[PDB]
Design a protein around this ligand. Structure first.
Ligand code: AMP
Ligand code: NA
Ligand code: NA
Length: 365
């Protein structure tokens, strides 16, 4: 079905078509029928899936225009970062020209956002900390919210916003539509689905997502590869990074090496107990650990957070392994980056990978 085939108001369709948007992405095609009818859903998606429009369109269609001075918002979208709040606010503004969208975030003054809220708003796109400040001030009123969106729930959890998110949702009416989007579903997300949502349908598009990350094949010697990795990590300065290697022993050697060189790194391998694995992934999610060095076996699962950089320390054996590793990159609206380290010997190994993947990697020449 094209967008014109969905039940959308004439102005909304015209806005889509003006931007050359005609055909829903998979998450949009699956979510729209439920979302347009005000039902709750969990959208398990990563990068470049079009999840923003999957909630912006229902907000646009469900909310009628209002010119009431000082009006309270009827939609709340919560995002983990200022960067994402700005991108989402921008998209919602273009999808719904009839709604006043207000972006709310910290790092700046309180004055301009306060004035905008007081003037009247239809939708608020906010980081949870600043939204909560305005709520307690009495500036942001959420009693008329009809749609609440949690965009990247697992990352809000990682930024320490869990209690803020729950407070904000509790300030909205219980008849609200709730839409939750997240790459992973940790315990806190499942608690939300249970206590803050109404039997949401889960739609998981992980297996049908476009490649959004930058890929670079980097020639690197076997000897002293650790220093090469460490310098790359300092230069790139990712908030979270995952480094893949072949064996358990390697994950230990590398994690310990990176720790010695100043990186908060930990090994993730198959011989850890569930306690050990839970603590590692928990520390990773929380930011206490920022580099995870893992084997392919240990990284299988839904409990692994998205990262900003994936490094292939050894080459993957197969295209399947390459994609499983590399798909972990990209969070918070950013496409992320993948680096394949390869030695003097492995040129054809890389070419075979490219052939199998059906995609050429950028050569650092
Ligand atoms: N139906 C669509 N057709 C083509 N591109 C889209 C569509 N929906 C969203 N996009 C774009 O896909 C990118 C990824 O969106 P998101 O996954 O929401 O960050 C953004 O640049 C969107 O503008
Ligand atoms: Na239509
Ligand atoms: Na992607």
């Amino acid at each position: 079905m094209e967008f014109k085939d969905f039940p959308l108001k004439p102005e909304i369709l015209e806005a889509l078509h003006g931007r050359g948007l005609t055909t829903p992405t998979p998450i949009q095609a699956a979510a729209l029928p439920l979302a347009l009818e005000g039902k709750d859903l969990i959208g398990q998606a990563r990068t470049g899936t079009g999840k923003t429009l999957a909630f912006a369109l229902p907000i646009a269609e469900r909310l009628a225009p209002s010119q009431e001075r000082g009006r309270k918002p009827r939609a709340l979208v919560l995002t983990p970062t200022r960067e994402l709040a700005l991108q989402v606010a921008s998209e919602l503004t273009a999808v719904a020209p009839h709604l006043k969208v207000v972006a709310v975030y910290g790092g700046t003054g309180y004055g301009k956002q306060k004035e905008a809220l007081l003037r009247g708003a239809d939708a608020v796109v906010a980081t949870p900390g600043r939204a909560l400040d305005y709520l307690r001030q009495g500036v942001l009123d959420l009693s008329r919210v009809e749609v609440a969106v949690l965009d990247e729930a697992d990352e809000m959890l990682s930024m320490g916003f869990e209690e803020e998110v729950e407070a904000l949702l509790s300030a909205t009416p219980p008849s609200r539509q709730t839409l939750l989007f997240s790459a992973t579903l940790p315990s806190w997300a499942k608690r939300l689905a249970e206590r803050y949502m109404k039997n949401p349908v889960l739609i998981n598009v992980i297996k049908d997502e476009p490649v959004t990350y930058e890929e670079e094949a980097v020639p690197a010697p076997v000897r002293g590869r650790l220093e090469v990795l460490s310098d790359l990590l300092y230069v790139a300065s990712p908030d979270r990074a995952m480094v893949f290697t072949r064996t358990k022993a390697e994950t230990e050697e590398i994690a310990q090496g990176l720790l010695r060189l100043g990186h908060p790194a930990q090994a993730l391998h198959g011989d850890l107990s569930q306690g050990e694995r839970e603590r590692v992934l928990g520390a990773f999610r929380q930011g206490e650990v920022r580099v995870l060095v893992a084997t392919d076996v240990a990284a299988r699962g839904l409990d692994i957070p998205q990262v900003d950089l994936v490094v292939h320390y050894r080459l993957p054996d197969r295209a399947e392994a390459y994609q499983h590793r590399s798909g972990r990159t990209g969070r918070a609206g950013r496409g992320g980056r993948v680096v394949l380290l390869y030695g003097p010997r492995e040129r054809r190994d890389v070419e075979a990978l490219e052939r199998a993947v059906g995609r050429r990697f950028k050569r650092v020449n």
